[PDB]
Design a protein around this ligand. Sequence first.
Ligand SMILES: N#Cc1ccc(Nc2nc(N)cc(-n3cnc(CCO)c3)n2)cc1
Length: 273
Amino acid sequence: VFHKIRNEDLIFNESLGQGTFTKIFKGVRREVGDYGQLHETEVLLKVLDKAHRNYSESFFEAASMMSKLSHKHLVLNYGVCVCGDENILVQEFVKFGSLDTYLKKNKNCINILWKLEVAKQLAAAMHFLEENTLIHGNVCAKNILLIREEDRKTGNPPFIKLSDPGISITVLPKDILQERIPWVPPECIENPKNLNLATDKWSFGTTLWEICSGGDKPLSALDSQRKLQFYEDRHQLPAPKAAELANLINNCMDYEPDHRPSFRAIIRDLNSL
Ligand SMILES: N#Cc1ccc(Nc2nc(N)cc(-n3cnc(CCO)c3)n2)cc1
């Protein structure tokens, strides 16, 4: 279970965007830290919409299991605030935000080595989850956070963390799942209860495509009906302009879930490049 944080110890500041049935804010948490020192800590406040409070269990189940495992590439959740009529997840504040936005704003200076390094880090996080048989369920660039930028001057690579998946696709309305094609894999469009470790391998491929496409959203030009037919006709995504990872993307986005490669094999493939 999560640590409970009092509403009185939280300050809400600027909106940082939205997720499915959620709103995201920068905030501050007043707390007693190590050695009894008082801190005012920057936090990320993720607020479930009041009109959708019936999703609260799924909303928190998302963060909870992951938070039971500690890992350098997994986002740190501090706790929850459920004072009053609020359902709030309190998470570490990451300096450079989510990867979808970062890729869009920085595509003109993100090269193949940056992408490869980010791909390796995401794959390491997914390998850790796979070895713990823990399904994420919503791997996408919007759920990757950039802790540290690349610094060629000190040879330092960028550093990312995988964030929580949000409300599960197993409880979400069908139209939202359809709009999430091609992150949601075909077997889960057919039946959301098919959610499996193999799900994350497909979504990881879609996420690599995002990383390689400067923040473009694959199939964004297709409405929901056409995204459905894309799966019915068994199409693959087009290779990104910088196509170094295209074979890996397509191997991960295998319409046969049992044929998708282990994250160990994915990592060995990345290391070959
Ligand atoms: N300009 C700007 C700027 C924006 C955001 C941050 N920091 C931050 N920290 C987090 N822990 C999570 C997020 N975040 C943002 N969008 C999502 C979507 C769901 O993943 C998550 N952003 C820092 C700078």
